[PDB]
Amino acid sequence: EVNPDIIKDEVFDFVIVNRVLKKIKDLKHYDPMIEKIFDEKGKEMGLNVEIQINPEVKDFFTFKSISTTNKQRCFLSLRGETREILCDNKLYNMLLAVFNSYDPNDLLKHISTVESLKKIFYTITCEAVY
Amino acid sequence: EVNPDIIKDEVFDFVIVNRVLKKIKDLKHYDPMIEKIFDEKGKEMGLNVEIQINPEVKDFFTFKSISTTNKQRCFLSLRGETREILCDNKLYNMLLAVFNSYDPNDLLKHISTVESLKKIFYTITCEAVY
Ligand SMILES: [Cu+2]
Ligand SMILES: [Cu+2]
Numbered sequence: 001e002v003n004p005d006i007i008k009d010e011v012f013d014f015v016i017v018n019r020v021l022k023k024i025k026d027l028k029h030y031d032p033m034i035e036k037i038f039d040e041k042g043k044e045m046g047l048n049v050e051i052q053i054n055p056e057v058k059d060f061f062t063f064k065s066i067s068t069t070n071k072q073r074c075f076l077s078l079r080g081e082t083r084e085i086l087c088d089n090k091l092y093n094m095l096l097a098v099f100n101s102y103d104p105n106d107l108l109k110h111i112s113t114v115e116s117l118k119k120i121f122y123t124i125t126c127e128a129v130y
Numbered sequence: 131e132v133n134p135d136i137i138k139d140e141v142f143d144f145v146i147v148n149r150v151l152k153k154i155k156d157l158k159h160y161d162p163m164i165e166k167i168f169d170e171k172g173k174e175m176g177l178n179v180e181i182q183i184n185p186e187v188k189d190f191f192t193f194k195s196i197s198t199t200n201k202q203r204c205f206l207s208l209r210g211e212t213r214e215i216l217c218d219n220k221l222y223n224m225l226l227a228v229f230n231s232y233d234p235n236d237l238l239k240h241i242s243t244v245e246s247l248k249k250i251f252y253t254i255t256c257e258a259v260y
Contacts, residue, residue, distance in 0.1 A: 083214070083256070084213070084214060084256045085256050085257075085258060086255055086256050086257050086258075090258075090260050091258075094260070120258045120259070120260065121258070123258040123259045124256055124257065124258045125216055125256070125257060125258075126213070126214045126215050126216050126254055126255070126256040126257075127215075127216050127254065127255060127256075127257070128215060128216075128220075128221075128250045128251070128253040128254045128255075129250070129253045130220050130224070130250065
């Protein structure tokens with residue numbers, strides 16, 4: 001609801017914030033759109049995060065995370081197509097690998113991790129145990 | 131877009147229709163909401179299917195399938211929560227197991243398969259290869 005802007009501040013009992021957000025050198029590069037959830041009949045509960053992986057083309061490649069009381073769900077968007085992804089350390093490392101490698105003196109490496117993540121994207125399958 | 135109603139008719143080059151829809155004894159029990167996709171700048175392309183697994187409580191437990199030119203995506207909804215699921219024969223059998231076991235002389239068996247599918251639901255994880 002109310003959407004703050006900076007994490008370099010108050011603490012949060014959310015993993016996306018401790019595991020990924022807080023370790024991004026330049027959080028602003030990525031247009032962090034971050035609403036906080038509560039005031040709806042409830043009162044201070046979840047966090048709703050959106051990062052642009054390609055801030056040159058809004059919404060071309062985005063990362064969203066919805067965190068609540070108990071659960072968290074993760075999503076990736078590439079070219080209009082959304083896919084949920086398991087929130088884990090594998091995804092986190094891939095996320096920071098991309099987020100923390102921007103550096104104009106090494107575009108090649110950064111773009112390398114970006115293309116690696118799209119690869120991951122097309123890989124996601126949603127499965128159950130039968 | 132234009133939403134037909136009956137499959138006991140024309141043929142379709144879509145798996146949801148050949149593998150699941152066409153094998154449901156009483157397709158109407160489940161409020162098949164089925165739009166056909168095309169006329170949008172395109173022209174005859176996809177099929178958009180929605181089945182109510184609990185037709186007593188609209189949208190409490192639903193199954194949706196979006197089929198297009200090449201791909202198909204599958205979704206399950208239980209109590210407001212949506213989760214994509216891999217479209218395969220495992221899901222199909224689970225689907226018909228539920229859809230084809232309605233029978234007032236054996237509510238117990240039917241309800242048995244319904245509860246088994248909710249179980250499956252909470253099991254779905256979305257994973258990539260790293
Ligand atoms: Cu970049
Ligand atoms: Cu039933």
